[PDB]
């Protein structure tokens, strides 16, 4: 029983699993580490480069770099290393026996899809592989075929509306405001408290701090007044070396750059304004449904209170007669993969696979013919 493989890639996270399963088998960060210190211990285990979950264990002696930034790959060799580690070390399955399903950002340059297809057929001898949109699969995971979806990952944020299973290409909006930039901003605003983080491992530590002790304020000025006038909004984080820091005021300051990019100084508008503009670009007749179905996707939208603030900010710009509701599934981190696990399981999808033999007469552009 040959089953398809679903591999979801994003800048900072790679997931993989068999089609038709509830859970992905492998989840690990998309990191590549190379040793930085002088290695002098003859006879014990050293390697040229560490990748995946093993590299995150040895952050002290490694320089950690990401192959993908902003949804665009920078070094393809590191991407090959991650794919090889996923196919061999994590799942222990042959890549040339089972078909593989791949996802990417909607708006992207020409060369990315062609290079990805060329590498996936030539290196691993994949009999069939298909490319799909991430946000469309997230909407399929929610199980409604219509509505506007917001997927904000660690690489890039994008809102696409899908009506009757079609994503309108003109109404797609993309904003380069992700969680890694929020991590950098949190590091910059933690500088003024007296704690200094400069290395890449300290960036991962700051990211863990952001994941554990951040939340979204309903009213920004009132929360500033409360945090200035009282010490109730203070939590203590415990560093891996035993030191204790107090996060204090900054907890609602780092995620607020999502709504106001003037803190980062970005020219573009907020994420809620981006969603509102994407709704404005569509036809009037469907706008009701676009205001009726909106789901949140991505790990960046796991900040507490994101749904209430999003609903309030959309309702502020919306007409008074419109009804605004926001859907937030609890498993919004892994929705995209779940959608892939739906899409490969259908009986009409076996003809949707790209043929290995057809690529021989077509070439690397074949995906633009079929997808």
């Amino acid at each position: 029983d040959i089953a398809a493989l679903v591999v979801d890639n994003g800048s900072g996270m790679c997931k993989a699993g068999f089609a038709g399963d509830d859970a992905p088998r492998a989840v690990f960060p998309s990191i590549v580490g190379r040793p930085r210190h002088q290695g002098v211990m003859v006879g014990m285990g050293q390697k040229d480069s560490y990748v995946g979950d093993e590299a995150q264990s040895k952050r002290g002696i490694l320089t950690l770099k990401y192959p993908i930034e902003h949804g665009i790959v920078t070094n393809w060799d590191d991407m090959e290393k991650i794919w090889h580690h996923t196919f061999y070390n994590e799942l222990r399955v042959a890549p040339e026996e089972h078909p593989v399903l791949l996802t990417e950002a909607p708006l992207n340059p020409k060369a990315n899809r062609e290079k990805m297809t060329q590498i996936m057929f030539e290196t691993f001898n994949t009999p069939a592989m298909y490319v799909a949109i991430q946000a469309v699969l997230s909407l399929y995971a929610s199980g409604r075929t219509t509505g506007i979806v917001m997927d904000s990952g660690d690489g890039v944020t994008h809102t696409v509306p899908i009506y009757e299973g079609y994503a309108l290409p003109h109404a797609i909006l993309r904003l380069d405001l992700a969680g890694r930039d929020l991590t950098d901003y949190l590091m910059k605003i933690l500088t003024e408290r007296g704690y200094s983080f400069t290395t890449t491992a300290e960036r991962e530590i700051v990211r863990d701090i952001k994941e554990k002790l951040c939340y979204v304020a309903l009213d920004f000025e009132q929360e500033m007044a409360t945090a200035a006038s009282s010490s109730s909004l203070e939590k203590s984080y415990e560093l891996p070396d035993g030191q204790v820091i107090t996060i204090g005021n900054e907890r609602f300051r780092c995620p607020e750059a999502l709504f106001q990019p003037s803190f980062l100084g970005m020219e573009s508008c907020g994420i809620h304004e981006t969603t509102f503009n994407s709704i404005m670009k569509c036809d009037v007749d469907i706008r009701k449904d676009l205001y009726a179905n909106t789901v949140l996707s991505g790990g960046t939208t796991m900040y507490p209170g994101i749904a209430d603030r999003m609903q309030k900010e959309i309702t502020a710009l919306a007409p008074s007669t419109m009804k605004i509701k926001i859907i937030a599934p609890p498993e919004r981190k892994y929705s995209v993969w779940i959608g892939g696990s739906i899409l490969a399981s259908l009986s009409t999808f076996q003809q949707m696979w790209i043929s290995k033999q057809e690529y021989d007469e077509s070439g690397p552009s074949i995906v633009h013919r079929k997808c």
Binding site: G165, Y166, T348, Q351, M352, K370, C371
Partner: peptide, 8 residues
């Protein structure tokens, strides 16, 4: 199936 039918 019928979105494959006319295009893509």
């Amino acid at each position: 199936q019928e979105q494959f039918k006319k295009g893509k």
